[model samples]
Target: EQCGAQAGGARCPNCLCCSRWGWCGTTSDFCGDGCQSQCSGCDGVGSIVPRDLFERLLLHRNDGACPARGFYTYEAFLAAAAAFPAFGGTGNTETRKREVAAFLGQTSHETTGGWPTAPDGPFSWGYCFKQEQNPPSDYCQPSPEWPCAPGRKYYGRGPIQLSFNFNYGPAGRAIGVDLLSNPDLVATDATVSFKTALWFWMTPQGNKPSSHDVITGRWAPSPADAAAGRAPGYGVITNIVNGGLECGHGPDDRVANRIGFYQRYCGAFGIGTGGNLDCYNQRPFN
Candidate 1:
C-alpha cells in the first residue's frame, strides 16, 4: 500500500521512510529532504518558541469578540513546526529567534483583526482571525496539476491566509495533508493551518527566495535582485510575500503594519530589529 497523505493518509511500515511523493522506502530519496517525519527520518532542530513568548505575541486575541480566540495556539504552532526542520532551526540562536519572529509578524498582518485605534495598539491584535473575512472571490485559479475541487472555496485561510488551488495542492502534498480536496482543513485543523503558513514561509516561489533563507542569512541578493533594490533583510521578505500589493510604492500603511509587528516581536525576544524593515523602494519579485 502507498504511504503518506498521497495515498489517503496510509502510513508506511515501521522503519521505512515516507517520501514527499508518497512512496515508502529506505533509500536517501525517501529519508532525505522532504521526507515525512511522521513516518521516519527527518529531524527537526529549531529552538521551540517558548509558550510565554507565544502567549505574548498574540495576547490581544484573547479578547472575547475575536473569532480566533483559541484557534492559533502555541501547541498547534509547534506541531506544525515539527514538520519543517530548517525553519527556525537554521543558524545561531539570534538568527533562529528573528526567523520565528518574522514569520509570525508577517502572518499577523495577513490575518490581523486589529484596527488603528484598537486597545493595546493594532500590532497586538495578531492572530485574531484564522481565515479571510468577506473574501471577494473564491480565489480559484486555473491549474492542470492542482485543479479546483468542485464546490470548494480556496479563499485566504490559515496563518498566511493561503489561497488558490495551486498552493493548497503542493502545500498539502508537502505536509502529508490533502488540502486540495478539503481546503477547509486550513481553517478547522489548527496544526494544518499553521503548517500551510510554515510551508509558504519555507518554500521559495518562482524566482523568489524563501523568507526563511532571507531571515536566516542563507540567501543573498543577486545582481538582478540588487538592481531591483532587493536586499537581504526583512524588507525583502515583505517583497517576497506580497510585494505586488505593498512594495515599490514609496511607503505603505500595510507595509508599515508588517514591520510594526516584526519590531514588536523582535523586542519581545530581546533582540534588535535588523536593518531594511520596509520594502518601500524595493521592486516586487517576479
Candidate 2:
C-alpha cells in the first residue's frame, strides 16, 4: 500500500508496508491492498471519523468536473480534499484527531447492513456502487456548477447524506461554487460536501454538535441534562438531527432506534447520559 505517488497502485507487487501496518481490512489503506489513499483506506487508519468531525465528521472539493462515481477510492477523497477549500484540513493535530474519531465511527456504524437500502461504504452514495436495485436516493446529484440538482431530494452525499434541494443550494453557495449541474461533486469533491455538511451541522441548532457534544461531554443533552438510550431526544439533541433520521420519528420503533444510537454513542465515548432515559422521549436515527 505504498503512497505519496511512489508506492504505485494495483500495479505494485505485494506491497507489505500498508497491508501489514494496519488491520486486516487494508482495502482502504494507502500502502495496503493498493487502496492508494488514506481516506479510502477502510483499514480504519482513523483519518476521518464521526464523533470528532464538526462534532460528528467530513468535507473537501476540487476542480476538473467530478469523476465517474465521485468517490471510486480513498485516493480520490484525499485529492478532492487537497484541491477543494470546502473540505477543511486538520486545522491542527487536535482537530485532526477529532475528525478521525467521528469519521471512523460514522462509517463503521452506517456501512453495516442496517437500512432497507443499506449503504455499501462510508461515503453516502457508496451504497449505490455496483448495485442497481435501490437507486431511490440521489445523494450525489447537482453537479459542480449547480451543486443543487434540479429535481433531486437528498442529493447531498458523504457520510451525512446531505439532502433536500434547499440544503444543496446553500451548500453550494456557501462554498462559493455551483453544484446544481454536477451534483456528483459531493462525492467526487470530498471537502466540498464535507465542509457543507459540517457547516450545516455546526449551525448552532445543527445536529453534529448536538450529538457529538453530548457524547463527548462538551455539552449536555436536551432538558439540559435529559438522557436517552437510542434516539437523540427531540428537545435534547435540539434540532440538529431530531427528525426520523436523527433519532426516530415514530412513537417507538424508529425513534427508539435513534435513542439506541445515542445511547451507544454516549457509552462508547465514556460520556454519561447525564441521568436517566427520562429525556429520550422523542428521538430520531436510521
Candidate 3:
C-alpha cells in the first residue's frame, strides 16, 4: 500500500527517501547510511514490546487484575501473542500500540476487575480475576460436532472469559488442546488461557469481524454494518465484542470500564487517543 500522504518522485511519504532503484522502503540502501529517520515502511515491524516492558506496563499484575500473576508472566503472554500475528504484528507503530491497548482493554475487563478509586486508581487494577463468578448456569450448548464432556461444565475462564461448549470445542481444536474434554484447563493452565484469548481475538464469529481485524484497520463495513452505524474505532470494537447487550443503550459501566483501560494504556504508550473512543452514538451491528 502507498503511504498516507502519497509518495512522489524519490521522496516517500513519512519523509523517507526512495532509493535510485525506486523502492520506497527502509534501511541505508534506501536513504543512505546516514539516514536520520530509520522508520520501517511497514507498521508493527517487529516484536511489539519486550518482555520487560510488558511486565513493567502491567505493574499491578501482581497487585491485582491477574489472578495467576506469577504463572502468567510477561513471557507467556508475549509468546501467546506471537502465535497470532494478526493481533498486533502488522499495524504501524501508533496503530499497533492501539491494538495492544484495545486488546488488553477488553481482556483486562473480562478476567480482571478495577475500581476507579483503588490505590494507583481504577485503571491500575486489571487481570484481577481469572474465572467467572457465579455464572447463571453452566455455559453448555448442544453441538453435534462437539459434545459436552460427562459431568464437565464450561463456564467463563481464562483472560477472555471464553465460555460455552461451542467455543471450547473450536478453540481447543485450533490450539491443539482438548478444551471440550477438560474445560477446566482454561483457568488451570496459564499459557493455554492466554492462547484461548488470542484465538478469540483473531477469529471472527457469525457475521462479526474479529476484534484484531477491526482494531488493526483491516475490516471494512458491509451494507448491513453501515446501516447499523458501525464504524472503525474503539467503540466499534465494543460493538463487535458484545454489542447486543452493552451497546446502543447509553451509559453502561461495562463499556466505560473498557474505555478506561484503553485510554490508560494509550497514555502509558504516549500516543494520541484516536477517534471513535465511545459507542454511545453508534448502533450495535445486526
- For lDDT, the strongest prediction is 1
Model 3, range 1-286, lDDT digits (tens) per residue? 1332233432466666555455556667666753333244422213666665566556576853455566566766866776776667767878887788888888877855566677777776777776788889887878889899989888899878888999999999999999999988888887788899989988888888888888888889888888777788888888877787889878898889888888888888778767877777678765
- Give me the overall lDDT of model 3: 0.76
The TM-score of candidate 1 is: 0.83
Per-residue alpha-carbon lDDT of candidate 1 for residues 1-286, written as tens digits (9 for 90 to 100): 4687777777677757888888888777888888863444433433447888888888787678888888888878888998888888899888888999999999999988889999888989988888889899998897889989999999999889898998999999999989999999999999999999999999988999899999998898899999999989999999988999899989899999999999999999889879999999998885
Clash pairs, model 1 backbone? none
Per-prediction TM-score, please? 0.83, 0.42, 0.80
How far off is model 1, as Cα RMSD?
10.2
Candidate number with the higher lDDT (2 or 3): 3
Model 1 weakest 10-residue run by lDDT: 37-46
Q: Which has the higher TM-score value, candidate number 1 or candidate number 2?
A: 1
Candidate 2, 16-88: lDDT as tens digits: 2333333223343434354333433221222443324322222211112322233434443354344433222
Off by over 4 Å in 2: 1-99, 107-156, 191-193, 206-212, 221-239, 245-286
Name the top TM-score candidate.
1
The CA-based lDDT of model 2 is what? 0.40
